[PDB]
Design a binder for this molecule. Sequence first.
Ligand SMILES: O=P(O)(O)O[C@H]1[C@H](OP(=O)(O)O)[C@@H](OP(=O)(O)O)[C@H](OP(=O)(O)O)[C@@H](OP(=O)(O)O)[C@H]1OP(=O)(O)O
Lengths: 91, 91, 91, 91, 91, 91
Amino acid sequence: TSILDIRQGPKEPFRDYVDRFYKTLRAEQASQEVKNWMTETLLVQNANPDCKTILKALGPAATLEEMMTACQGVGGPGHKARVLAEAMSQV
Amino acid sequence: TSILDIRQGPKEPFRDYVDRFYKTLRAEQASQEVKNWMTETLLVQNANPDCKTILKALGPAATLEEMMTACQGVGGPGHKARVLAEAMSQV
Amino acid sequence: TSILDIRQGPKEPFRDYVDRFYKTLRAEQASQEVKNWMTETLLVQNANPDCKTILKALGPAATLEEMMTACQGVGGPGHKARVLAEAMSQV
Amino acid sequence: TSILDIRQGPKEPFRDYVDRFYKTLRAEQASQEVKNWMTETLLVQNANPDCKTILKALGPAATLEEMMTACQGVGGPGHKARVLAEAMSQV
Amino acid sequence: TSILDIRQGPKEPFRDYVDRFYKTLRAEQASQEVKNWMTETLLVQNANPDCKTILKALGPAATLEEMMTACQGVGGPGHKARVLAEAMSQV
Amino acid sequence: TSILDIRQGPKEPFRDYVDRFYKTLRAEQASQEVKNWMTETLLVQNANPDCKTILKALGPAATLEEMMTACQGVGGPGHKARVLAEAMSQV
Ligand SMILES: O=P(O)(O)O[C@H]1[C@H](OP(=O)(O)O)[C@@H](OP(=O)(O)O)[C@H](OP(=O)(O)O)[C@@H](OP(=O)(O)O)[C@H]1OP(=O)(O)O
């Protein structure tokens, strides 16, 4: 069980993914700075596309609470209705 | 396990979220007034968007039974059909 | 675990909700008449909107078998298709 | 646990419902003829609407294998697509 | 637990159904030729309609790997979208 | 439990499928080169159609991280909305 393998499922909510991410990070053989850099790269690098869109919309300099607050709607009725409406609109 | 971390899932019903909220609140090192203020801030602050819409519609001075009664339809067939209909209508 | 807290989930079928309702009612400190009045008030008062619509359509003087028979379709394919069709029709 | 209480869930497949029906019937205090009559009344009487439609379409003199074969499509993609198409068509 | 009772659920994937089919077949009191004939009759006879369509499309002289390969898409997004599109098209 | 039997479910995410694939591969009686060839044939050969489309789009010379990164969106809201939009568009 390594940190590079923690990938977000297509239907897994973002909070469970980040929970598994830090849980695996606490059990990884690496220094503190390396764990911080992994937090700044792999946590967003290994997300699902539906959340990588919103996380890419927040841009850099976004805190963890802002990311989780911005992605906790993915999956819910409003987000699915909006995504389907945009898909039918553009196609 | 802290109180600031209890966040509502995108598909979790509101009643389970408030149940976990008070369950974690009973096991938090804080005075009574602090627990009341946390109840008045974090419970609505850390909800999912689909319920934050209705809770924002009820406005302040709304009791817990009014919130739970107003949000227990989120997820059900009628709410999903209405949200999808509005999404197709505006887009 | 009190009787006032038994609320129907947005996706829970009506039969499971009434099962939990009577199960909790048998373990509540109240007289027989009080349990009957609770059966006549809270069981319909604390239902989800999708079932409160049909239970409101049956009106008073409706037996338990009539309620459960009228609400056991909520969630199924026909009910979801009809609700979505009405939502698209009115919007 | 009585036989009159075995009701089909809105999303439960017909085979699980009839399995619970006969399982409860084997543990009911009634004679053989009474169990046969219960099989001929309650098994179809206490089904969900989506299956009561097809079972009503088969009419009487239909065997158990014909009922289960006719209702094992309820829930699947084809049945949901057809029901939704008819709902959008009539509304 | 007999072999005639193993029926595919409306939402069960074909691989789980055939797994239960052979698992029950190994524990059935019948000769080898009888088990082969049961494999050639009941495995396709007792499938759900959504898979009986594709298995009927493959025709006879189709191997097990061809059946499972042809039916492993039932349920997935592409198959549901195609079935719904055809349902809306014909209705 | 053989390696030829590990097939991806219609709703199983790709990461769970490849996890079971390597887990079963580590417990298979075969040399290293044979396990590598099995990795280069069966892992893509025995996928579901929704992922075989994207894996066929990546073409050969694609690494495992590229495959998993390209298929982790299958199932999510965006992929389902896009597939449904294309299905309604072509039909
Ligand atoms: O009433 P159901 O037949 O069980 O329909 C559900 C429902 O889909 P729809 O509301 O779009 O019909 C779920 O949607 P949610 O609101 O839970 O999001 C969806 O789950 P996904 O969100 O993952 O799409 C799930 O689909 P799946 O089979 O892929 O789990 C699908 O169930 P059926 O596909 O069995 O209809």
